[PDB]
Amino acid sequence: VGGVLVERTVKEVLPALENNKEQIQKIIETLTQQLQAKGKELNEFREKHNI
Amino acid sequence: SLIRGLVLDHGARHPDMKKRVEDAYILTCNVSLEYEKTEVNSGFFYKSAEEREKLVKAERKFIE
């Protein structure tokens, strides 16, 4: 860490990388997937509203 | 000639609109039914590409 090198046992250090990466992988699959369909729909939307 | 009413000089651009009018309910409208038939609006000018595709659809509409 920033002003410290924290001493830890594996027992805390091991599961931190376990669940965090896995928890990150869920969220990242969601939005980047949703970004494409937004562009799909926003390409239809932007031609409509701007009169 | 003596015109007790007025005289406009124009028929717009279209003849035979029933341009002979006995009962005249006068709409003087300083706003056009011609805003434009093209993509970009009457006062809205764009040399950027993505902003022009935006106005092409409803410019012909806001006329109708």
- DSSP assignment string, chain B: ---SS---S-BTB-S-SS-S-SS------SS-S-S-SSSS-SS----SHHHHHHHHHHHHHHH-
Cβ density class A17-47: b for 16+ within 10 Å, e for less: eeeeeeeeeeeeeeeeeeeeeeeeeeeeeee
**Spatial separation of the C-alpha atoms in residues B41 and B48, rounded to whole Å:** 14
The answer, for B4 touching chain A at a CB cutoff of 8 Å, is no
Technique used by the depositors: cryo-EM
| A29 three-state secondary structure | helix
Using an 8 Å CB-CB cutoff, list chain B residues near A46: 50, 53-54
Residue B52 burial (10 A CB sphere; 0-12, 13-18, 19+):
middle
Residue B43's closest chain A neighbor by CA?
A: A51
Separation in Å, CA A32 to CA A37, A39, B40? 9, 11, 33
Nearest CA in chain B to A45: B54
